[PDB]
Write a protein that binds this ligand. Structure first.
Ligand code: HEM
Length: 409
């Protein structure tokens, strides 16, 4: 750190020092991870696109990307044909999924799976969901500190995803064991074994449901020979895997983020209890205020592009901050406070454009059932520790909590 003084004096007196200082990409420290909404507002005050750099962890590398902040600038980017999720500008099922597909080929996969994710067709799963939630609160621990995130938020999608693919009751516990292994890095070998076991088992379920149709939505996906074309045996597994990882962490932190807020907006935690007709707006307001996905998946510039009067060269990586657009005061009045009664439909927590959340209707209902069952029962709830001591997990795209310590009271 003992840099030669003459060299430093040469740079300081050059008057190029601010320009070189400006061109450095802003490293996203843990302060951003805890409180990015202040960082987004600090950035959007000056522009819409900013050169930022994630800390080593995208794998082990400080990756210079473009962070886009404005609501309309985010929204237009999510619908821009020049901003592809295919970064290319013997493939495994983990690399061929629809989320990474450009509209040329994405349209076919999106339409085939569309029919089975209808709001009403997704409502068939509700009593199977309603009952599944109820077991976890009965099995909830007895003492005051409960860590709601671990005991209820974590297991709920695991049983819901098991319903989604339509796992047979006999082969249930094996699938959940694979799922909990995959979502928690207990050891490199256990997740590696579970990942293969699930992909191979999913492929066998593809064959099993092929000749034996069943009520569950995965069988509806298999039965979808809609255009005289059907999803291929590889594409079924890729679609099913994307449902698993694309739905697990999102639904967990949808519950955790929402429940965390009402713990300090108890005057709105109450209001939800007296009126259950506000729940469909409660979930939307939860997703807008504290979107589980801070940013959409990485996008690459197809051609030369302009965002917020800042040119983006082709081949550059762009990160669309959904949390910034959701908390833009220009689109949502007083964006930093939870108001359950806002008009909905303007938020982009489910993204926008062609890659709009396929599991949105499932995620929509899930929290209302989760919150409502959490509302019908156990209403003396109170947060067990001041949020200042609580942390946020270090993640690239997800906004989630390390824990949700609650007191049942
Ligand atoms: C619970 C709250 C959820 C949130 C906030 C959320 C958020 C998102 C976002 C922002 C995207 C677009 C990402 C991008 O375009 O870069 C997306 C896509 C997707 N999500 Fe989620 N999601 C949620 C729940 C779920 C669930 C429960 C499932 C499945 C069971 C699911 C499956 C998918 C799939 C398959 C896509 C890709 C759709 C496509 O590419 O056409 N999501 N989601």
């Amino acid at each position: 750190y003992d840099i030669p003084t003459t060299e430093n004096l040469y740079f300081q007196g050059s008057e190029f020092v601010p320009m070189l200082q400006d061109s450095v990409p802003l490293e996203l420290d843990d302060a951003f991870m805890q409180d990015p909404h202040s960082v987004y507002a600090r950035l959007n005050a000056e522009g819409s696109a900013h050169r930022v750099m994630m800390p080593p962890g995208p794998v082990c590398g400080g990756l210079p990307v473009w962070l886009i902040t404005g609501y309309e600038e985010v929204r237009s980017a999510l619908a821009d044909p020049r901003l592809s999720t295919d970064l290319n500008r013997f493939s495994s099922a983990l690399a061929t999924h629809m989320l990474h597909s450009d509209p040329p080929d994405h349209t076919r996969l999106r339409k085939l799976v569309n029919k089975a994710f209808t709001s009403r067709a997704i409502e068939k799963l509700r009593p199977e969901i309603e009952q599944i939630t109820g077991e976890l609160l009965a099995a909830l621990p007895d003492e005051d500190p409960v860590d709601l995130l671990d005991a209820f938020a974590f297991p709920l999608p695991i049983r819901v995803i098991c319903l989604l693919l339509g796992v047979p009751l006999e082969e249930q516990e094996n699938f959940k064991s694979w799922s909990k292994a995959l979502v928690s890095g207990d050891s490199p070998a256990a997740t590696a074994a579970a990942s293969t076991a699930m992909i191979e088992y999913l492929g066998d379920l593809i064959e099993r449901k092929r000749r034996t149709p069943t009520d569950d939505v995965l069988a509806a996906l298999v039965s979808a020979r809609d255009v005289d074309d059907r999803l291929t045996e590889t594409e079924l597994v890729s679609m099913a895997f994307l449902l698993f990882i694309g739905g697990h962490e999102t639904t967990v932190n949808t519950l955790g983020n929402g429940t965390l807020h009402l713990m300090r907006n108890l005057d709105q935690w109450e209001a939800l209890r007296q009126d259950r007709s506000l729940l469909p707006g409660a979930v939307e307001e939860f997703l807008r205020l504290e979107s589980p996905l801070k940013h959409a998946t990485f996008r690459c510039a197809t051609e030369d592009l302009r965002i917020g009067d800042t040119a983006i060269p082709a081949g550059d990586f762009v990160l669309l901050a959904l949390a910034s657009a959701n908390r833009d005061p220009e689109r949502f009045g007083d964006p930093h406070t939870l108001d359950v009664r806002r008009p909905t439909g303007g938020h982009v927590a489910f993204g926008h454009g062609i890659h709009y959340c396929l599991g949105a209707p499932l995620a929509r209902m899930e929290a209302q059932v989760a919150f409502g069952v959490l509302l019908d029962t156990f209403p003396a709830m109170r947060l067990a520790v001041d949020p200042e001591d609580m942390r946020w997990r270090t993640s690239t795209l997800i906004r989630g909590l390390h824990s949700l310590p609650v007191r049942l009271n």
